[PDB]
UniProtKB/Swiss-Prot annotation, chains A, B, C, D, E, F, G:
Coiled coil start-end: none
Subcellular location: Cytoplasm
Origin: domain of life: Bacteria
Family (UniProt): Belongs to the GroES chaperonin family.
Species per Swiss-Prot/TrEMBL record: Mycobacterium tuberculosis (strain CDC 1551 / Oshkosh)
Database matches in PROSITE patterns: CHAPERONINS_CPN10
Keyword terms of this UniProt record: Chaperone, Cytoplasm, Stress response
GO term, biological process aspect, one: chaperone cofactor-dependent protein refolding
Disulfide bonds: none
Lineage of producing organism: Bacteria, Bacillati, Actinomycetota, Actinomycetes, Mycobacteriales
Pfam families with a match to the protein in the record: Cpn10 (PF00166)
Stated name of the protein: Co-chaperonin GroES
Protein encoded by which gene: groES
InterPro entries assigned: Chaperonin_GroES, Chaperonin_GroES_sf, Chaprnonin_Cpn10_CS, GroES-like_sf
Subunit structure: Heptamer of 7 subunits arranged in a ring. Interacts with the chaperonin GroEL.
Keyword Metal-binding among record annotations: no
Amino acid sequence: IKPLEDKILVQATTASGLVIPPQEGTVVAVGPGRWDEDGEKRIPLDVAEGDTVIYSKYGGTEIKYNGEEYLILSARDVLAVV
Amino acid sequence: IKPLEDKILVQATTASGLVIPPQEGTVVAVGPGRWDEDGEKRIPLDVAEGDTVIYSKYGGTEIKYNGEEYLILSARDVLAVV
Amino acid sequence: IKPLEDKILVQATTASGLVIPPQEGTVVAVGPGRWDEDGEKRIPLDVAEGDTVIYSKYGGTEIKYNGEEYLILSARDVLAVV
Amino acid sequence: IKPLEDKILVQATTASGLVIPPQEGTVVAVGPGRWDEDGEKRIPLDVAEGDTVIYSKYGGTEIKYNGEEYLILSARDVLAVV
Amino acid sequence: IKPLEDKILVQATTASGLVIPPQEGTVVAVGPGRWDEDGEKRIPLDVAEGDTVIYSKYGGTEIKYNGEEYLILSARDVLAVV
Amino acid sequence: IKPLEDKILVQATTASGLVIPPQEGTVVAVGPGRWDEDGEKRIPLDVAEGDTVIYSKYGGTEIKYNGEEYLILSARDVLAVV
Amino acid sequence: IKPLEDKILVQATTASGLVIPPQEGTVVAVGPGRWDEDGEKRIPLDVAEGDTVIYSKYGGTEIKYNGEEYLILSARDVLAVV
């Protein structure tokens, strides 16, 4: 599963030591990014595989595979990295 | 059926080995791409014919032909390729 | 009837051999196109007179003339050509 | 009455020989056009006085003058010229 | 009362000879205009003091001063000049 | 209290001699302004400390301090200076 | 916790000496900023760690950690620094 431009695939108290009154997870896959409006180049994402991130699930598309639960979410949903 | 600029024609548990609690399908046709705002060049899509993709059916335009079910959906709908 | 910049005049199971659960039709007229944002040039449409196209009728303006039914739709509405 | 940048003043089955299930009318006045976002130049409108056009009445501002009924509508509303 | 960039101060059948089924009035003050997005220069308004204009009252901010009723309305509201 | 880029801090019949059927007030603090979309420079605001201004309270964020009632509103809200 | 591009992590009458009829707090972390639309560079934020700011909680994402309450809110939410 290769997220298309812009999306990132995230593998779904929190195991990090944080209480969330917004899930936490590990970036497993990342895409190319949104091309410039000019199409000259693509803007890169500031998250990379293995990054443990905090995101919201809005617009998320959950999909399960061999025991793991994955989420294909847009980069706009990743709020922070711990 | 030749999708016009930006649209891709997709042919509609999953045969890939994935559980989708969003459909999966095969990219059958692809268009030119949205022109730059400047009209200089068109932005290329990151899916090609034969690609097996995961997309959402929103705004989709289903059309049946000789027993097959097709969907003309915008590129913004394709989330990932497996 | 001359579609102003960007619009295209379309003449309204399908005679093509396609089942549409989106209408199909024949492009009878086409406009100049959206000027670039800078106003330098116009972007051209990828459809021309006689093309048989598949489109959605959203925002369409139906108008009848000498027994034929016509639709002035924006280029954003034409999804494919057969 | 001089339509300010972008608007055109239109003078309101149709007298042209068309059935509209969108009114038809004669372009009586036209404005300069929208300035470039950069304000370098203004974008010209593809309609001129005397043009007989088909448009929609949305956001239109009807005003009556010496027995004639006029409409100050934005350029975006003129769909085609006959 | 000096309209800040873009706004124009207008002083509120019509005395001009027009019937409005959109009020008419006299431009009493005009502002600098919107800066370009680049900030290089401001885009000028096409109304000047003394201009008698037709506008809509949407988003207007009526204020009364020494018996006169005034309106601070955005230039986007002034439709034409008579 | 220093209004961040673009906001201005205003200090809340009117004492100017105007009737407002929109409050009037004094500009106590002003921010740097919105960076160009390019980030090259920031766009300056056309009001300055001491300016007595007429604005709308929409989106305003009222805060009191030592008996005085203040408002942090975006420049888009300041309509004119008297 | 590292706010991704544009967000800033804030640490939640007010201890400053202000009455808020909008919370106040201390900027604990700051993100790179939004890339330019062109992606050339990122626009910098006008708040830095330690800044005590006044913001609104809209769209905020509250998260507690070792007894402290934090908020990951977008820069658009920071209204002023005291």
